[PDB]
Each structure stands twice: as structure tokens, then as C-alpha cells.
Amino acid sequence: MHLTPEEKSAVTALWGKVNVDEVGGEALGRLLVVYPETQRFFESFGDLSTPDAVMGNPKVKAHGKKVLGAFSDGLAHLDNLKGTFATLSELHCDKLHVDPENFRLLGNVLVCVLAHHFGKEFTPPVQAAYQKVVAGVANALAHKYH
């Protein structure tokens, strides 16, 4: 990862203020609402017919939280994303059949949700550092596709 010390701490300081329950459900929820193609993978989650149904769905919310916890592990092992996400890489490939192109979509919704929550604090330089991280994650998740 081409992250600078100023950026690594830019990311870390912000991350410590993140409400994982709110941001996780909001990110996974918006993924499903803004890019309805992705619902194909969550048909087992139940009712996802409308925005209000997606955003209020307890399995959506709970799963979002899990996704953020894995993101968290990545921020703590930034110099080794490839090794941190390897198992999850194999999982999303072997069991779930997810096209890695979807990983970029979640990264970007994620960035939009951070901006929604932090306002002024999510300044252009902070977003740039988050953009590098989210790409890092997306690449790490695609690495074991075969």
C-alpha cells in the first residue's frame, strides 16, 4: 500500500470515531438500494423490495456490522491486506461466486457514507486516503480468485 504516514493517521483518527453499527448497516443497505443488482447475493436476507425495507432489515444491519469489522482488521494490518483477506477472498470466490467488480461498488458507497456522517471533517485529503484504502481492500479481496 502506497500510504503516507500522514495518511495512515488521517485514516486511523477518523476511524476511531466511527459508529460501527450505524455505518455498517448504512453502507450495506445503500449498496443494495443504489445498486439493486447486488441483491442477487442476499435473497436469503428476506424483504429487500424498497429502501425502507432494506434499511430496516435486521440481517442487513447485522451483516453490515460484520463487514465493517473485517474492514477494521484491514486498517490495523495495512501493510499486509493480501494476507489479512486471503480466507475471505477464497470465500467470496469459491462459495459465494461474487464478481470482484462489486467490491469497488461497496468501497465507494462506504466512502459516501463516511462523508454523510462526518461532513466538514471528511476533507478532500482525508477522502483521498480512504480511497487508497478501499482500493487496497478491493484488490486484496480479489487476489485469490482462480
Place of cell 464478481: 99
Neighbours of 41 (CB within 10 A): 15
In the complex with ligand HEM, the residue whose CB is nearer, 92 or 132, is: 92
**Whole-number minimum distance, CB 54 to ligand HEM, in Å?**
13
Query: Coil, strand or helix: which one is 122?
Result: coil
Q: Does 75 bind ligand HEM (CB under 6 A)?
A: no
Query: Which pairs from 43-47 meet CB under 8 Å and 24+ separation?
Result: none
Contact pick of 22, 42, 127, 144 for ligand HEM (by CB under 6 A): 42
Are 136 and 74 spatial neighbours (Cβ–Cβ below 8 Å)? yes
Closest CA to 28 of 45, 13, 15, 16: 45
Q: How far apart are CA 76 and CA 87, in angstroms?
A: 17
Q: Does 81 bind ligand HEM (CB under 6 A)?
A: no
Place of cell 447475493: 41
Q: Does 118 bind ligand HEM (CB under 6 A)?
A: no
Pattern of binders to other proteins over 38-57, x per CB under 8 A?
--x----------x--xx--
List residues binding ligand HEM (CB under 6 A). 38, 41-42, 44, 66-67, 70-71, 88, 91-92, 96, 98, 102-103, 106, 137, 141
List residues binding other proteins (CB under 8 A). 29-30, 33-37, 40, 51, 54-55, 93, 97-102, 108, 111-113, 115-120, 122, 124-125, 127-128, 131, 142, 145-146
